[PDB]
């Protein structure tokens, strides 16, 4: 049974609600982004209208085989009418194709559903600038002040400089980057660009990347592993055993691996600056955990909400425990008292 925070009152609509069977009253199912917790339940046998971005719709058709007649892609930053209700899709600054959805209810209420997002000050000059929002369905993944991490630009600077130094010292080093979903493609594309290489990967991952509308992608990636000195591997293989095994397969071309695991936040963020990050090393293998986030930090979240001034907030993450729910409610009240709305 579909939970309340996935339903949009006053409409036939649900958001990211595909794992509940046929939802009673739903005439259109919105999908914010192609992450498995959110698409869970979609397959080629699905027969209701799915509304999403162009990029999400590429992935639904090619990766999950949803039939074309049920895929309804909408352009961003554009007022569209869906089953009699005005909607807008906005870039969520999460993974490729991720959106926030603005719903203009027939009674005059305005609802923003953030999906998954990384709040940015640029959002204060989107179509959100122009009107009041009554209800906010909020990505509260990191809603506590302990969750700090650097900008994506500082993290990429660290990675580029680390990879370039290592491979210039040793032209026989291979770089490996872990992946298990879409998102975070800047990590491996920025490192391959500094090294003058394409990125090598499996046929399955190449297929996924071909759906993403990234400019000049045919110039940046390949399935020919032998021609590439940056390889992508499943995240589960980013450990000393998995990397040892991979280096064997390279036929004595390489004699060292430098590997990256982009994580979200980890408790080593509470003590260490990005500049001071060091790897775990065993012999000729080193592994860096880098804090590349596609969700808001606490301070980015707080700034966005204090700017938007919603009348009510509905969290969409961390909703299963009373302790989480109590914590989040306290922060929302502080923010409102401090700002005056
Ligand atoms: Ni996500």
Curated annotation (Swiss-Prot):
Entry's induction text: During mitosis. The mRNA encoding this protein contains an internal ribosome entry site (IRES) in its 5'-UTR. This 5'-UTR generally suppresses translation while specifically promoting expression during mitosis, when cap-dependent translation may be impaired.
Q: Where in the cell is it found?
A: Nucleus
User: Where expressed (tissues)?
Assistant: Expressed in brain, heart, kidney, liver, pancreas, placenta and skeletal muscle.
- What happens upon changing residue 139 to N? Impaired nuclear focus formation, reduced interaction with PIAS and increased sensitivity to cisplatin
| Similarity comment: family membership | Belongs to the DNA repair metallo-beta-lactamase (DRMBL) family.
Q: How does it assemble?
A: Binds constitutively to TP53BP1. Binds CDC27, which is itself a component of the anaphase promoting complex (APC). Binds PIAS1.
Job of this protein = May be required for DNA interstrand cross-link repair. Also required for checkpoint mediated cell cycle arrest in early prophase in response to mitotic spindle poisons. Possesses beta-lactamase activity, catalyzing the hydrolysis of penicillin G and nitrocefin. Exhibits no activity towards other beta-lactam antibiotic classes including cephalosporins (cefotaxime) and carbapenems (imipenem).
From the Swiss-Prot or TrEMBL record, give the protein name: DNA cross-link repair 1A protein
Organism of origin: Homo sapiens
Part of the intact protein present = 700 to 1040 of 1040
